[PDB]
Amino acid sequence: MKSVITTTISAADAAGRFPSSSDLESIQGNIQRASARLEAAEKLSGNHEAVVKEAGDACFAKYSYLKNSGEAGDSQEKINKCYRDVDHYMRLINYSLVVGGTGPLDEWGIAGSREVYRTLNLPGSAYIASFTFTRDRLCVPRDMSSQAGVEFVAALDYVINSLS
Amino acid sequence: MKSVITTTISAADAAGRFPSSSDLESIQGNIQRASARLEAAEKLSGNHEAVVKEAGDACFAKYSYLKNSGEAGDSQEKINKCYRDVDHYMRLINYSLVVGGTGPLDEWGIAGSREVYRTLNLPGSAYIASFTFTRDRLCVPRDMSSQAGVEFVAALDYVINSLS
Amino acid sequence: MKSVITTTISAADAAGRFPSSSDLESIQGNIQRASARLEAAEKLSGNHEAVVKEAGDACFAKYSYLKNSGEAGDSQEKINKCYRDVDHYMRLINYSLVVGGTGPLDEWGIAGSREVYRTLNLPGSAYIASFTFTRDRLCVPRDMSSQAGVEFVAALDYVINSLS
Amino acid sequence: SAADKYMARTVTRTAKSAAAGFGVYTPQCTEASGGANTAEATRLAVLAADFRLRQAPLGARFADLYETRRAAVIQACNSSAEEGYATSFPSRAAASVAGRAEGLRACSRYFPQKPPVEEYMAACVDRQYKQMRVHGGVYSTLCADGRSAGDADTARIAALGARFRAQHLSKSQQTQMRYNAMSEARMLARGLCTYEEAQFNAYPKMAGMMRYGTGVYAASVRGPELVVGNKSMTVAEQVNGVNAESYWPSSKVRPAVARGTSPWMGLGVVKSYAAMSEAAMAYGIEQQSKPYVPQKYEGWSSGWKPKSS
Amino acid sequence: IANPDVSSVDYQLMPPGSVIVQPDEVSAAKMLPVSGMSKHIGKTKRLVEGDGLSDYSRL
Amino acid sequence: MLDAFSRVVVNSDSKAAYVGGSDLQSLKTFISDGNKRLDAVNCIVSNASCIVSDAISGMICENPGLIAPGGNCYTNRRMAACLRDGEIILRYVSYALLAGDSSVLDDRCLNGLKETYIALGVPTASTSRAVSIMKAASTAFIMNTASGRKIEIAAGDCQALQSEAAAYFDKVGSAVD
Amino acid sequence: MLDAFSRVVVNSDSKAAYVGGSDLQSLKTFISDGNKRLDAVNCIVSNASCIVSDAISGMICENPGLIAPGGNCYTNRRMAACLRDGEIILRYVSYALLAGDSSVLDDRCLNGLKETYIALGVPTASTSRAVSIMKAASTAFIMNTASGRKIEIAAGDCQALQSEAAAYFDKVGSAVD
Amino acid sequence: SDGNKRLDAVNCIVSNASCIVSDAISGMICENPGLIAPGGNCYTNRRMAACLRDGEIILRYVSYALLAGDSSVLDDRCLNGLKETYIALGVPTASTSRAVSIMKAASTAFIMNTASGRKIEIAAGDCQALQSEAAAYFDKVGSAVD
Ligand SMILES: C=CC1=C(C)[C@@H](Cc2[nH]c(/C=C3N=C(/C=C4\NC(=O)[C@H](C)[C@H]4CC)C(C)=C\3CCC(=O)O)c(CCC(=O)O)c2C)NC1=O
Ligand SMILES: C=CC1=C(C)[C@@H](Cc2[nH]c(/C=C3N=C(/C=C4\NC(=O)[C@H](C)[C@H]4CC)C(C)=C\3CCC(=O)O)c(CCC(=O)O)c2C)NC1=O
Ligand SMILES: C=CC1=C(C)[C@@H](Cc2[nH]c(/C=C3N=C(/C=C4\NC(=O)[C@H](C)[C@H]4CC)C(C)=C\3CCC(=O)O)c(CCC(=O)O)c2C)NC1=O
Ligand SMILES: C=CC1=C(C)[C@@H](Cc2[nH]c(/C=C3N=C(/C=C4\NC(=O)[C@H](C)[C@H]4CC)C(C)=C\3CCC(=O)O)c(CCC(=O)O)c2C)NC1=O
Ligand SMILES: C=CC1=C(C)[C@@H](Cc2[nH]c(/C=C3N=C(/C=C4\NC(=O)[C@H](C)[C@H]4CC)C(C)=C\3CCC(=O)O)c(CCC(=O)O)c2C)NC1=O
Ligand SMILES: C=CC1=C(C)[C@@H](Cc2[nH]c(/C=C3N=C(/C=C4\NC(=O)[C@H](C)[C@H]4CC)C(C)=C\3CCC(=O)O)c(CCC(=O)O)c2C)NC1=O
Ligand SMILES: C=CC1=C(C)[C@@H](Cc2[nH]c(/C=C3N=C(/C=C4\NC(=O)[C@H](C)[C@H]4CC)C(C)=C\3CCC(=O)O)c(CCC(=O)O)c2C)NC1=O
Ligand SMILES: C=CC1=C(C)[C@@H](Cc2[nH]c(/C=C3N=C(/C=C4\NC(=O)[C@H](C)[C@H]4CC)C(C)=C\3CCC(=O)O)c(CCC(=O)O)c2C)NC1=O
Ligand SMILES: C=CC1=C(C)[C@@H](Cc2[nH]c(/C=C3N=C(/C=C4\NC(=O)[C@H](C)[C@H]4CC)C(C)=C\3CCC(=O)O)c(CCC(=O)O)c2C)NC1=O
Ligand SMILES: CCC1=C(C)/C(=C\C2=NC(=C\c3[nH]c(C[C@H]4NC(=O)C(C)=C4CC)c(C)c3CCC(=O)O)/C(CCC(=O)O)=C2C)NC1=O
Ligand SMILES: CCC1=C(C)[C@@H](CC2=N/C(=C\c3[nH]c(C[C@@H]4NC(=O)C(C)=C4CC)c(C)c3CCC(=O)O)C(CCC(=O)O)=C2C)NC1=O
Numbered sequence A, B, C: 001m002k003s004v005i006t007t008t009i010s011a012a013d014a015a016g017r018f019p020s021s022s023d024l025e026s027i028q029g030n031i032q033r034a035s036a037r038l039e040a041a042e043k044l045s046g047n048h049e050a051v052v053k054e055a056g057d058a059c060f061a062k063y064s065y066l067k068n069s070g071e072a073g074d075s076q077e078k079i080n081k082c083y084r085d086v087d088h089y090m091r092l093i094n095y096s097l098v099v100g101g102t103g104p105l106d107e108w109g110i111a112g113s114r115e116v117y118r119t120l121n122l123p124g125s126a127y128i129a130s131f132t133f134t135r136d137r138l139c140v141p142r143d144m145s146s147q148a149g150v151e152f153v154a155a156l157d158y159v160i161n162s163l164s
Numbered sequence D: 001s002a003a004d005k006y007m008a009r010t011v012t013r014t015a016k017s018a019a020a021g022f023g024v025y026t027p028q029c030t031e032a033s034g035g036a037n038t039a040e041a042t043r044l045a046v047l048a049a050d051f052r053l054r055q056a057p058l059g060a061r062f063a064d065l066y067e068t069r070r071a072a073v074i075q076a077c078n079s080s081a082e083e084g085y086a087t088s089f090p091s092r093a094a095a096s097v098a099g100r101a102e103g104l105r106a107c108s109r110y111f112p113q114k115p116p117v118e119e120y121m122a123a124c125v126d127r128q129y130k131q132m133r134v135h136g137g138v139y140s141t142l143c144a145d146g147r148s149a150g151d152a153d154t155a156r157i158a159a160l161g162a163r164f165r166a167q168h169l170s171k172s173q174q175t176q177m178r179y180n181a182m183s184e185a186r187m188l189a190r191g192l193c194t195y196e197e198a199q200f201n202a203y204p205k206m207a208g209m210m211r212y213g214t215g216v217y218a219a220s221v222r223g224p225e226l227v228v229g230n231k232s233m234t235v236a237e238q239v240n241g242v243n244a245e246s247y248w249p250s251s252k253v254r255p256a257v258a259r260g261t262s263p264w265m266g267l268g269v270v271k272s273y274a275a276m277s278e279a280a281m282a283y284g285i286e287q288q289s290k291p292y293v294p295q296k297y298e299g300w301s302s303g304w305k306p307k308s309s
Numbered sequence E: 001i002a003n004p005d006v007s008s009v010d011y012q013l014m015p016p017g018s019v020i021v022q023p024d025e026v027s028a029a030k031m032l033p034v035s036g037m038s039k040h041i042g043k044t045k046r047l048v049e050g051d052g053l054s055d056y057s058r059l
Numbered sequence F, G: 001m002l003d004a005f006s007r008v009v010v011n012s013d014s015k016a017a018y019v020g021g022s023d024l025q026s027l028k029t030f031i032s033d034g035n036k037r038l039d040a041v042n043c044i045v046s047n048a049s050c051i052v053s054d055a056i057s058g059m060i061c062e063n064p065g066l067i068a069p070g071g072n073c074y075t076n077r078r079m080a081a082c083l084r085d086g087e088i089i090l091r092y093v094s095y096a097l098l099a100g101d102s103s104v105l106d107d108r109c110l111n112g113l114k115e116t117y118i119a120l121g122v123p124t125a126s127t128s129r130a131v132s133i134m135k136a137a138s139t140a141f142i143m144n145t146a147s148g149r150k151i152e153i154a155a156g157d158c159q160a161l162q163s164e165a166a167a168y169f170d171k172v173g174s175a176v177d
Numbered sequence H: 001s002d003g004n005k006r007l008d009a010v011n012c013i014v015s016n017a018s019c020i021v022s023d024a025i026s027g028m029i030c031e032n033p034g035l036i037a038p039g040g041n042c043y044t045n046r047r048m049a050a051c052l053r054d055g056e057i058i059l060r061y062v063s064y065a066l067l068a069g070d071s072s073v074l075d076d077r078c079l080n081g082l083k084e085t086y087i088a089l090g091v092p093t094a095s096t097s098r099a100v101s102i103m104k105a106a107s108t109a110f111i112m113n114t115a116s117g118r119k120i121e122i123a124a125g126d127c128q129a130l131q132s133e134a135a136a137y138f139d140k141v142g143s144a145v146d
């Protein structure tokens, strides 16, 4: 998983050396930004269930045709998988938000997503509809003070730019 | 471009030998199946324009939402690009149909298609709707006698299984 | 669909010539008898439910064996089919009454009428009983003017003489 | 294609424009109905004939092509534009062979009978077209008398009243159809043929009796134009029409399939994630299922009595 | 203000599935505490924390 | 137009061999099953307007949108052509029950009908429904299990020939769909 | 083949209702506008070879490449079929002016003409030009503003009926293009 | 010449507004199942209220268009960019275009009294021109929503 610690230890391991003061300053920065991000993670684990509701409901609020034919949303069960995969992505945003690099959200969600989503009849645009809805529902000065919100925006940006 | 001739010549070149009787039997089979395939190509160049019309009109007959919002079909001009890309694919079916291998249809249409279509928010399901419409409009015993039709089915099969 | 104007247009069309003064006189007579026709159409559209009600009630009043087993309108649904058929008839009498020729009543109601009834073991004489009830009952002056009355009776007579 | 179709239609219109005179239709040709019975029955006989024409095997279409092409080349002498029309537009050429054969009044039924040996010879060549239809003991289905029980009775009636129509022609156009029928039978006489032209000489009925071609390929091209008339449905409407699942059968992408679970084991982790629970929603759909359809005829009148069981 | 004057959505004409009704809290005890303040029932819902600001000024 | 005889003769012609023993033996089972086929065709013929009337009126009762205004049964002449078409379908099914081979039924009606009904806008699902109703009705007559007509024949098993008739009706219903 | 009457009857048939008051009221305005339509059709008929000759010779004078060698007017028989076709166009427009509905004109000529002229090589822009000349000429006869003929009719306003005739000619000119 | 007839038409469309607005928006909801469902644009009570308000406003300014008899009143700044606002609030535009079409058809059927259910008594006339002005305005706006 790519984090500050793994990048600098892996880079010093590729170097063949003891970790000099550069890596020490890097993990110093990790323990500087840590509090702002972890506030974001605590609040995400706070109200994740309503994030599932508004996220998926906006996801079919944009595209209605998925509920129309047999294609990707034929039954209520496939819609359960819809909400399910959205909660997987939010759980990975919580994980990468805790780690602070995009490591677990990359190796668990993004890697090999394209063969699966292409193989199955799923349009990434509905996921992107969901995530753009979540970044449009960002209550900064009232819910996630300033920079917690910023880190949440950055991670979810990375989600969309990975998928699109 | 993968054809019979290029596969056997390239394979014999990698072998480091003159072309023995095996390659000769391969091109014997090419000149056996040639007439059936080329009748298909002549008829395709016959009525390709009506293939554009029915193909794209069925493509928006299934999915109407593309004409609804700004996403992929905002204007009449993007619909002209829709019919345009369909004619590219039919012209590549004509090309690979003449060559007889899937060479030009692979290197011209399929190669790197997924980064482009994924990048520019282009759904594959509408293409697949168009091509499945064309294979459902196969007039075999009256238009494309038997095996010309069969070769056309095979090429268009390869198109869908490349895209999906 | 037969009318004055369709007969004369089809006539001069059959000659391959422009419409002479004779066709002009014919459509002049159409716009002479027009107001009597449309007066009858207005009153028929006024009170059609009572006409169909008296028609079907007198139809089963003459023939009671229709409600016998299993030969005819023995159930509520079949008698509902009776009243809706009579309605179609008065609707077609209104239609040809507006047209002024027996065209739409012929091509919609009369054509193939004989074959359908025998197949369904539908007696035409009971239809005749219904229409002749509505024929005998009408008063030329009270409900409407005599000329419109004449037109209405003539159309209904056509129905009878086309039925059996 | 449809080019051929419109050309055929207008050549039939200029064909049947003859004999309609100047407005008075000359009932010598154009009634076609007889009584009311056969008035409605000729429409079903024509639709019968057309569908049996496209039932013809694929081999007969092309023999039909070279016969009608040959005939239409004889129809126009020199006339490079016209032979160009005969080569370039096939169903036009069929409508011009048949349409010429109409506008002349050359056909046999339009001939009345004044002598007997004329109709004996006519009966012989009649039997020749009968033999060229029915091959082997197996009856050809170009015959097409019955389409249901009782239609060909009305074909009898129409044929015999059609024989009665031949007599009340003006003798002018009767002598026209004699000389004119002779000329036609020498146009398409298949060579010079002293015996054919002399047996035509003594017998103008026999000059009428030459069936050049048939209507297989012109029906083949058109297909259903005659029934449908003007109602070619667009692809957009035809996909969204009644025959959606049959017009375009392969349209579906990933049909959802419901597996046959036992009710005892729920098999795993599922959340309804729905506004209404499945139990409640299935209940609502089953309660609201099908409204009693109220009917106007049974509607309460002024007064009323409630019926008693 | 958003009030339609001459206006009726029928909700019987809709297809049988597509009438969905949702309750914020499915309980008695939590819709009304013993004291007056409520986030669901009454005029007391006006006095929740948050929602004091407005995002329609983006037009 | 090929019966079972012409099927064996055409297949032996493609093989270019003589007819032999086993093929003729299966055709001997056909000849021994002859009178059963004769009585079967007699049963389906002697119930024609029966099966057509009940079948098509049942088709309208199943889906009442056909008699609705704008439907394909909505005209009196359209109903006439409807009943007539069902009658002709039953007629060629009866010819296929005589023949023992469906080549006649492939050549008369199965060729050109789907395209036709697409060109007219006849609902193919409803026609497949009516052919299915004529299937179950006709097999109920061929087992003599009609609950309003029970005619006297000596007892024999005819489930195979009934499956043959169901194969013809399923050939028509698969043809229109 | 549908007039005004059959248009109202077909629309009321699709609605499946009776004819009623307002539709018949609009058709009463048709009957009250009857003699104007009669005299209008008489004016367009009594100037036939007039309009065809001036129209097509004007078409050649606008674009003289038609009479140029290799053009579609360049043969004597081609000029014959040219004049004849213009005459038949004017004929079906006259039928549509009698009918009050363009269904006859849609069924006679308007269906299948563009693909025909593509098949024959007839320039569609030149035909649209000729139909436009017949449009302005015919409306100039229908307002009685012809600068070579001024016949006696009593005064009335017929701008709406003139717009109807212009709708027929614009239907033909839009049909060929 | 129009006067009491054009005023009569405007009074026919105006004293039929409740039926016309709730008609077209209820028929719009019926046309597609998703709007009603939770998370839909028109799921909450307030959003449905603004939906009916927008229907009433469209029909109201189309009625104002008729008395003046000129399309200039029908346009201007509030209407213009309406599409910019409906994009900036995520409002579906195909849905609105359908509702405007339904309002058009109900308006012409009221203006010709062919609508079965209301038979207000007026002496008969030709009004086709004015009907074409009514449908003219509804497809001006119906082109502007898309
Ligand atoms: C873990 C991360 C996380 C978030 C980022 C939030 C995001 C979020 N906000 C709301 C919900 C809300 N958010 C806001 C906020 C807003 N008020 C405005 O005037 C502004 C536009 C905006 C602040 C900038 C409001 C007003 C609501 C309630 C909306 C309503 O009920 O109408 C909801 C629905 C549940 C609820 O009502 O609380 C959610 C999931 N919740 C989370 O769990
Ligand atoms: C660790 C992270 C992680 C994810 C993010 C998911 C991603 C994912 N989703 C599916 C599978 C699926 N995902 C969906 C979801 C969708 N339904 C729609 O209408 C929308 C387009 C979309 C919700 C927004 C559906 C319907 C399926 C089943 C597809 C099918 O079987 O046709 C599958 C295949 C296996 C399966 O069937 O479950 C996978 C790997 N799974 C994971 O392990
Ligand atoms: C040699 C083969 C060959 C092809 C097959 C095409 C494929 C292709 N299409 C586009 C590009 C495009 N293709 C479409 C087509 C679509 N519009 C829709 O509504 C449908 C989903 C779809 C038609 C079925 C559109 C709209 C664009 C422009 C996309 C955009 O700019 O948003 C592009 C990017 C360059 C461009 O803008 O033209 C390419 C490479 N090009 C090629 O060179
Ligand atoms: C659209 C066409 C149309 C018609 C032609 C009439 C026909 C008609 N008349 C009556 C009904 C009637 N019609 C008459 C008329 C008669 N009085 C006599 O002395 C004479 C025999 C006769 C006039 C010549 C009478 C008296 C009644 C009432 C009969 C009764 O209630 O006893 C009824 C039953 C409903 C009613 O009571 O009004 C109907 C349908 N109605 C229509 O809708
Ligand atoms: C009862 C009286 C009676 C007749 C008089 C003949 C007339 C006649 N001849 C032919 C048919 C024919 N007749 C001829 C004869 C000719 N060959 C030539 O070189 C000469 C021009 C000419 C002899 C002088 C030929 C060649 C055919 C066949 C034409 C063809 O198939 O191309 C046919 C069509 C049927 C057929 O093919 O046989 C008929 C009806 N038949 C009759 O039933
Ligand atoms: C010219 C008209 C004509 C017919 C209509 C048949 C009638 C017919 N059927 C059988 C005879 C028979 N018919 C049947 C038929 C069946 N029995 C069943 O239980 C099934 C319901 C049914 C399936 C078809 C059977 C089983 C026999 C007796 C077995 C047999 O003879 O093969 C016989 C033998 C003589 C007799 O029984 O007296 C005859 C003549 N043959 C004809 O020549
Ligand atoms: C090179 C590839 C190639 C194709 C894929 C076809 C596709 C195609 N088919 C048709 C046209 C047609 N295609 C068919 C075929 C049939 N319709 C039926 O209902 C039957 C089920 C089916 C035969 C099995 C028919 C009947 C038409 C003409 C009418 C129609 O559109 O259905 C047309 C319009 C031109 C015409 O009328 O011929 C085109 C472009 N043509 C080609 O050249
Ligand atoms: C059988 C054949 C036949 C005809 C051809 C007409 C001819 C005709 N037109 C009018 C009458 C009329 N015709 C017109 C028509 C005209 N309006 C103009 O602007 C143009 C100059 C012209 C159309 C091209 C008008 C306006 C009247 C009424 C004149 C008036 O009352 O001032 C009248 C007097 C009766 C009436 O008022 O209707 C007659 C006989 N009538 C027939 O019976
Ligand atoms: C203050 C409110 C106010 C109104 C609401 C109108 C009402 C009104 N309309 C007309 C009169 C009329 N109104 C109409 C209207 C039409 N007829 C049709 O068949 C169409 C359905 C409809 C299209 C709009 C017609 C045609 C007339 C008669 C012609 C005319 O007077 O111009 C008259 C003339 C007097 C009378 O008829 O008694 C009046 C006062 N005027 C007003 O001052
Ligand atoms: C003229 C003798 C003749 C006939 C009648 C013929 C073939 C043939 N055409 C026939 C029909 C037939 N052909 C026509 C041709 C026709 N229509 C026209 O407008 C003109 C100018 C025509 C021919 C001169 C008509 C009117 C009919 C009557 C309509 C009908 O009865 O179907 C028939 C009658 C029965 C049948 O349809 O088979 C037959 C037997 N071949 C012949 O030589
Ligand atoms: C005077 C107006 C007139 C006609 C035209 C005929 C038409 C006609 N053909 C019939 C029936 C009929 N028609 C043919 C076909 C025909 N016969 C052949 O042998 C060959 C080669 C044929 C095509 C050339 C056959 C095979 C039959 C069945 C009777 C038979 O065995 O001949 C029947 C009987 C219908 C029925 O059984 O219900 C009629 C009415 N009848 C008329 O009154």
Ligand SMILES: CCC1=C(C)[C@@H](CC2=N/C(=C\c3[nH]c(C[C@@H]4NC(=O)C(C)=C4CC)c(C)c3CCC(=O)O)C(CCC(=O)O)=C2C)NC1=O
Pocket: F050, F051, F054, F055, F057, F058, F059, F060, F061, F062, F132, F133, F136, F137, F140, F141, F145, F146, F147, F148, F149
């Ligand atoms: C209300 C709209 C309506 C109809 C119309 C009927 C039509 C109908 N008849 C059936 C089937 C059916 N129909 C008949 C024929 C019929 N019965 C007889 O005894 C006699 C003398 C007959 C002709 C008069 C038979 C013999 C059967 C087989 C069942 C049986 O044993 O009766 C079946 C069952 C189909 C199946 O098994 O898949 C149907 C749906 N049903 C409807 O819902």
Ligand SMILES: CCC1=C(C)[C@@H](CC2=N/C(=C\c3[nH]c(C[C@@H]4NC(=O)C(C)=C4CC)c(C)c3CCC(=O)O)C(CCC(=O)O)=C2C)NC1=O
Pocket: G050, G051, G054, G055, G057, G058, G059, G061, G062, G132, G133, G136, G137, G138, G140, G141, G145, G146, G147, G148, G149
């Ligand atoms: C030198 C090559 C040449 C021609 C040929 C003419 C052809 C011609 N006639 C016109 C138009 C035209 N033509 C006529 C018909 C004509 N006038 C009558 O008064 C009578 C009795 C007529 C038949 C004999 C009328 C009535 C008009 C309408 C203009 C007018 O009021 O005269 C127009 C105007 C077209 C338009 O408005 O778009 C043209 C181009 N022009 C040319 O340049």
Ligand SMILES: CCC1=C(C)[C@@H](CC2=N/C(=C\c3[nH]c(C[C@@H]4NC(=O)C(C)=C4CC)c(C)c3CCC(=O)O)C(CCC(=O)O)=C2C)NC1=O
Pocket: E013, H019, H020, H023, H026, H027, H030, H031, H101, H102, H105, H106, H107, H109, H110, H114, H115, H116, H117, H118
């Ligand atoms: C099953 C889902 C469903 C609906 C909901 C309706 C909705 C509906 N109403 C229409 C159109 C329509 N609606 C009304 C208003 C309505 N009629 C009245 O007589 C009174 C009193 C009314 C309010 C109570 C009128 C007046 C019309 C015009 C047609 C007419 O004359 O009735 C139209 C036609 C639209 C068009 O012309 O483009 C539709 C689709 N249709 C559906 O399929």
